[PDB]
Amino acid sequence: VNQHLCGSHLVEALYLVCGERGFFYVPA
Amino acid sequence: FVNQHLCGSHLVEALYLVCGERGFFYVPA
Amino acid sequence: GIVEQCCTSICSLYQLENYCN
Amino acid sequence: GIVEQCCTSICSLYQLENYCN
């Protein structure tokens, strides 16, 4: 139910939704 | 201004993506 | 339901994912 | 960044997606 995507859950969400584009992740 | 709302085909298509192998059930009203 | 949540309002990823299966 | 938008705050699908490529 948590709205917030934090930490390794964020990288996982991007894995999912970016598919064959892939992505750039940086925490800063 | 840019729209964040998912409606119609856009919502079906989000479902399609996020649900991947799990599938989904959908009913447009 | 999802229209009220994701179309009328703005929904987060896990609210969307909750409508899967 | 993705952390201000989706973790601290709540992002929409399209906001999350905007971080792809």
Author numbering:
A (entry chain D): 2 to 29
B (entry chain B): 1 to 29
C (entry chain A), D (entry chain C): 1 to 21
Passage from the reporting paper:
Insulin is a small protein hormone composed of chain A (21 residues) and chain B (30 residues), and it exerts its biological effects by binding to the ~340 kDa tyrosine-kinase type insulin receptor (IR). Insulin plays a central role in mammalian biology, and has a widespread impact on blood glucose levels, lipid and protein metabolism, cell growth/differentiation, and life span2. To achieve the stabilization of a specific conformation of the hormone, we developed the strategy of inserting a covalent bridge between specific sites at the B24–B30 C-terminus of the insulin B-chain, i.e., an intramolecular side-chain:side-chain crosslinking. The evidence for the structural impact of the crosslinking in the analogues reported here comes from three crystal (analogues 2, 10, 11) and two NMR (analogues 8, 12) structures.
Because the B24–B29 to B26–B29 shift of the crosslink bridge yielded the high IR-A affinity analogue 8, possible larger gains in receptor affinity upon moving the crosslink further towards the C-terminus of the B-chain were expected and investigated by the B27–B29 (i + 2) cyclization of insulin. Interestingly, the B27–B29 linker does not significantly affect the overall or local (e.g., B20–B26) insulin structures; the linker allows even the formation of typical insulin dimers with usual dimer-interface hydrogen bond patterns. However, in contrast to 2, the B24–B30 chain of analogue 10, when modeled on the B24 site of IR-bound insulin (not shown), can, somehow, be accommodated on the L1 surface, and its further reconfiguration will diminish clashes with the αCT-segment. Therefore, the shortening of the crosslinked sequence and its shift towards the very end of the B-chain in analogue 10 alleviates the conformational stress observed in 2, allowing likely a more effective contribution of the B24–B26 part of the B-chain towards its interaction with IR-A.
